[PDB]
Design an enzyme around this catalytic site. Sequence first.
Site, PDB file in Angstrom:
ATOM      1  N   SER B 179     -90.788  80.409 -22.293  1.00 10.46           N
ATOM      2  CA  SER B 179     -89.588  80.747 -23.069  1.00 10.46           C
ATOM      3  C   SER B 179     -88.408  81.197 -22.208  1.00 10.46           C
ATOM      4  O   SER B 179     -88.587  81.652 -21.081  1.00 10.46           O
ATOM      5  CB  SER B 179     -89.911  81.809 -24.130  1.00 10.46           C
ATOM      6  OG  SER B 179     -90.498  82.963 -23.539  1.00 10.46           O
ATOM      7  N   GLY B 257     -85.870  75.565 -21.783  1.00  7.51           N
ATOM      8  CA  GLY B 257     -85.332  75.867 -20.467  1.00  7.51           C
ATOM      9  C   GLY B 257     -84.597  74.682 -19.864  1.00  7.51           C
ATOM     10  O   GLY B 257     -84.079  73.834 -20.596  1.00  7.51           O
ATOM     11  N   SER B 258     -84.571  74.609 -18.533  1.00  8.86           N
ATOM     12  CA  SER B 258     -83.803  73.581 -17.829  1.00  8.86           C
ATOM     13  C   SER B 258     -84.454  72.202 -17.865  1.00  8.86           C
ATOM     14  O   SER B 258     -85.682  72.076 -17.853  1.00  8.86           O
ATOM     15  CB  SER B 258     -83.554  73.994 -16.370  1.00  8.86           C
ATOM     16  OG  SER B 258     -84.696  73.755 -15.555  1.00  8.86           O
ATOM     17  N   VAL B 259     -83.620  71.168 -17.900  1.00  7.78           N
ATOM     18  CA  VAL B 259     -84.097  69.787 -17.839  1.00  7.78           C
ATOM     19  C   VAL B 259     -84.990  69.542 -16.618  1.00  7.78           C
ATOM     20  O   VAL B 259     -86.071  68.973 -16.749  1.00  7.78           O
ATOM     21  CB  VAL B 259     -82.921  68.775 -17.806  1.00  7.78           C
ATOM     22  CG1 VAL B 259     -83.435  67.369 -17.499  1.00  7.78           C
ATOM     23  CG2 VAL B 259     -82.177  68.784 -19.117  1.00  7.78           C
ATOM     24  N   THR B 261     -86.870  71.499 -14.836  1.00  5.24           N
ATOM     25  CA  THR B 261     -88.178  72.135 -14.948  1.00  5.24           C
ATOM     26  C   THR B 261     -89.072  71.409 -15.958  1.00  5.24           C
ATOM     27  O   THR B 261     -90.251  71.155 -15.695  1.00  5.24           O
ATOM     28  CB  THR B 261     -88.049  73.618 -15.297  1.00  5.24           C
ATOM     29  OG1 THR B 261     -87.311  74.272 -14.251  1.00  5.24           O
ATOM     30  CG2 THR B 261     -89.418  74.255 -15.397  1.00  5.24           C
ATOM     31  N   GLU B 285     -87.035  71.787 -25.357  1.00  4.54           N
ATOM     32  CA  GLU B 285     -85.670  71.952 -25.828  1.00  4.54           C
ATOM     33  C   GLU B 285     -84.879  72.307 -24.584  1.00  4.54           C
ATOM     34  O   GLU B 285     -85.159  73.312 -23.919  1.00  4.54           O
ATOM     35  CB  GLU B 285     -85.590  73.058 -26.879  1.00  4.54           C
ATOM     36  N   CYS B 319     -77.537  76.973 -25.317  1.00  7.28           N
ATOM     37  CA  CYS B 319     -77.642  75.532 -25.156  1.00  7.28           C
ATOM     38  C   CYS B 319     -76.745  74.802 -26.138  1.00  7.28           C
ATOM     39  O   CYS B 319     -76.504  73.619 -25.980  1.00  7.28           O
ATOM     40  CB  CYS B 319     -79.089  75.073 -25.287  1.00  7.28           C
ATOM     41  SG  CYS B 319     -80.046  75.671 -23.861  1.00  7.28           S
ATOM     42  N   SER B 484     -77.132  77.811 -35.369  1.00  8.65           N
ATOM     43  CA  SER B 484     -78.028  77.168 -36.322  1.00  8.65           C
ATOM     44  C   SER B 484     -78.882  78.217 -37.038  1.00  8.65           C
ATOM     45  O   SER B 484     -79.304  79.205 -36.438  1.00  8.65           O
ATOM     46  CB  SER B 484     -78.904  76.126 -35.622  1.00  8.65           C
ATOM     47  OG  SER B 484     -79.798  76.723 -34.697  1.00  8.65           O
TER      48      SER B 484
HETATM   49  N1  LIG Z   1     -80.115  77.180 -31.884  1.00 12.00           N
HETATM   50  C1  LIG Z   1     -79.180  78.040 -31.159  1.00 12.00           C
HETATM   51  C2  LIG Z   1     -79.184  77.704 -29.666  1.00 12.00           C
HETATM   52  C3  LIG Z   1     -80.531  77.896 -28.975  1.00 12.00           C
HETATM   53  C4  LIG Z   1     -80.410  77.847 -27.463  1.00 12.00           C
HETATM   54  O1  LIG Z   1     -79.331  78.204 -26.943  1.00 12.00           O
HETATM   55  O2  LIG Z   1     -81.388  77.442 -26.802  1.00 12.00           O
HETATM   56  C5  LIG Z   1     -77.789  77.838 -31.734  1.00 12.00           C
HETATM   57  O3  LIG Z   1     -77.608  76.970 -32.594  1.00 12.00           O
HETATM   58  O4  LIG Z   1     -76.827  78.506 -31.332  1.00 12.00           O
END
Ligand SMILES: N[C@@H](CCC(=O)O)C(=O)O
Lengths: 546, 534
Positions: B179, B257-259, B261, B285, B319, B484
Amino acid sequence: GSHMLRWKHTSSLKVANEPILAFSQGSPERDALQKALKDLKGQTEAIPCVVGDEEVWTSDIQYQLSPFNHAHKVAKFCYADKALLNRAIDAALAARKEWDLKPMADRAQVFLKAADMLSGPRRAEVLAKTMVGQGKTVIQAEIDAAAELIDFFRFNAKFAVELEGEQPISVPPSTNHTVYRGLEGFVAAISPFNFTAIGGNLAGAPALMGNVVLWKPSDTAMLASYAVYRILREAGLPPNIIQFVPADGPTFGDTVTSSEHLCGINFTGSVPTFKHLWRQVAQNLDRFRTFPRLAGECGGKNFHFVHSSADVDSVVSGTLRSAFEYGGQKCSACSRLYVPKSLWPQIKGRLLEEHSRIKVGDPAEDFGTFFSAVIDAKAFARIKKWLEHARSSPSLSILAGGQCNESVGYYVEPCIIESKDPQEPIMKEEIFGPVLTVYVYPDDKYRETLKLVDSTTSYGLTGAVFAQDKAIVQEATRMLRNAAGNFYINDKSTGSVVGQQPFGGARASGTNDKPGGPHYILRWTSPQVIKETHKPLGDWRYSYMQ
Amino acid sequence: LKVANEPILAFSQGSPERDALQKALKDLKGQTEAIPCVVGDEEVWTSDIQYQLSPFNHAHKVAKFCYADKALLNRAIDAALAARKEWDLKPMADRAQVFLKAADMLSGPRRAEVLAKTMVGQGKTVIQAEIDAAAELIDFFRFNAKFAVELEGEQPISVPPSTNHTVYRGLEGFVAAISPFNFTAIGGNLAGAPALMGNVVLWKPSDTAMLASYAVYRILREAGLPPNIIQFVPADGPTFGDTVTSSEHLCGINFTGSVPTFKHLWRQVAQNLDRFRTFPRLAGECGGKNFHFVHSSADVDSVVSGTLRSAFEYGGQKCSACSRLYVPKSLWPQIKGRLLEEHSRIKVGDPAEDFGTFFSAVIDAKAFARIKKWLEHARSSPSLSILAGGQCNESVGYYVEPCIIESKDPQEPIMKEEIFGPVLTVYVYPDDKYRETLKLVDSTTSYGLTGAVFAQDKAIVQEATRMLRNAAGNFYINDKSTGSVVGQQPFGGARASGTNDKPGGPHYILRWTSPQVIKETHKPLGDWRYSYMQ
Ligand SMILES: N[C@@H](CCC(=O)O)C(=O)O
Ligand SMILES: N[C@@H](CCC(=O)O)C(=O)O
């Protein structure tokens, strides 16, 4: 606050399983099948690659032989070269956006129409081509090229149309909607010889979900596979949505895994080939525009486990069918039978008696045939090696069968072997032939033997327990939870039916995406969620900050 | 099971939640928690001692923890595998109950604690902690519980004389959950969702989110999670990845995390395919280079506030954060003037001491250094101009001011590469080149995570929606690209942004079950022959 995006209501679809026909004497379906078989006798179809609507021939000419009469070339086809495969990719990619933007219901219509064609006017054709080209008997062709394929098309259409009704919660001041996008790129579909229906599903299910597909069908199922392809096109599948591209396996894999646009591989076949493709994708991970999705259904070393409380007759008939139908050439076929000592005299006697009544022969000429020749020379050679191992191994004894003859077709008699060693290689390795191995265990060691059932092989596909004791059934069910993805209580380990027993298993048997159930299609969509807000936003600050 | 979203509290003066949070913050001031690895019920210390620092006051060590070594990780795998069968055999509802109880604890008596630990340990402001450690985490737990219990109701057709039933088995083996620092809730979901579905998990929490992550872990245990279902195993990244990908029993990696990795883990799994008992399932993700695209018809005030929030909340460390803004020439004088004026009022500071703070320090020295490199790039590039901000100071905390840059080059590296800092780049396009610019939004980057279009013209919105179909997995019309909400905007995207398994929606849990279908036949089977053969 008017909504600038408007979403239409989603419809529903009523489908039921395709009825299995009886092919009784004088019946229309028996007459039609006999005529279709007659139409194929002495015929060779020249089957091209199809890219868009263009029929393309390369110089790499290949033949499909009739397994039970290998002098009969049922098809002449060709392998797509790397140039043609790359052309097929480019053309598919150029067709993808429009297809993806089509309403799900419009894509579903193609498959519903194809299903109706298969059910009715084209049933005899696809059955006959599966019989002559893959060596299936009438009923094996019927449950496959008709019923299962038709069911895949109808049930996946239903699942897909209804999936659009799976929508998120909206709370003022916003409206949320999920768009079930196809995958961006192309999908490679690689199908096996043993079921005509699997090819249709591997290429068809991703196409239904808005994908474009390069379909490499099995060389040894080419005749029936092309029949299915043509039906899809006649049913309204636009050009460049599924490219019909037979090809050398390694060549095909090398080409598709080298494309930056690969977004999926839908594979059914051997474990080693699936692993190879998985490794090729990993090696090339940096070139892909997105992470490709790999789906693989592979083999099994499947069990029938008998408890002392079992109904003997059911054990016998269910095991004979599971082990020997279609020459045991099913990833679901029973190849290890575990019998308690107390029932072995009864079960052995009955197995041997019924064995002597099994007819092996030409399925087109003699409907009395229980099963016919195995698929090709390579399969025949492998099975022969195992039969030779049975004779040489001190722990193995051939109880019935053991004969084979490849002079006219690749004919192998059903073979029943007893092993005194529950870890013998023959108890572990998938043969894909009509070869059943029996291990007899002392009644008092049933619990320990259940552990052997679970641990002996690397596979986790199908299995059955035969028992009338409820507590025993519950115990065996708990113990064998991960030994079989399709688990059977007092029924045979083969013959999953779409919508009733979604099919697949884990361990070495594949990724278990359960084609035949409602979730399989989810592998072939990459959802987008749209939120439209209908009121102006306020300040960037929050009230607590004051 | 009926569930609704957790309310977001307002934290007004004199409110119970503000009083409670202030107390919890005071409780953590000057505190260091010694956080062990947890394998089963054993608290284990190794000699590889590590510290989590408060990002806005890095002299404050908020936690002392340790890295599990290969030996400890392997013992954690062994213990988890031995607990898995019983856990997987539990009714789905019984497993769900643990997460429902945890959710109630987070909502009420533990809300202030998890918020405060997220603020002090990860540098979040009140509202950023609230939407994360409380609302989103609570929502993951409640909604996934609902999804899981309802999934058991998805059953096949039975036809006499047989009965068919689907058993939603957990995956056989263990799942590695890895995570990120930026959301406490993501850690809870990455470890919790697979556990809910009957899996056992080695959870490697982010070093820089250790305090709040352990708080969630303890809440799960107190809520009834049995020992050895989730192992709490901080570890060196490469060591953890090497160890889990070397185990024949690995059955899944749940990664955020990072692409690079994620790709490395994917390659390690592929290299070791022959060793695994089954094919491991990888869920990833990753990052985004997210856009706000403005049409001339846009509501300017919404563009301004939405963009300021998306680009700068939590220091742009999302992200989903907007890092590229496309503005038509006709609206640029308005948007530029408003952005720069509002910028001057953004308070960057200590979020525990000053609730007026809009956002605080970035997470660590490594992030600070990476962001500084991008600011230095902006000062160097002939196509980039810093319009506001650009200051940074790491003497007390890892403080970076919000920075607004204009690029004359829509394809500048800063328009393409994820910075994960409070750095917004603006490209101004001529109004008559709007369609060409929409195409650029889609073609410029490798990513496909979030994006927004601001426009008040229906035809434009419909056109932009179609054109940007694959440019964003979470797409927004007249709202910001972040934030989200579980059950409302299931989250994720494709292209380089990950596998798009849509956590927050009903299908995510399917990645963590491997179904078995049981057919029981209630009549004897009869003959092996078929009638047509006679
Ligand atoms: N789901 C979060 C982002 C999650 C993340 O930054 O990994 C959002 O919509 O802001
Ligand atoms: N699903 C088929 C087996 C498919 C295969 O052999 O690949 C069955 O249950 O018999």
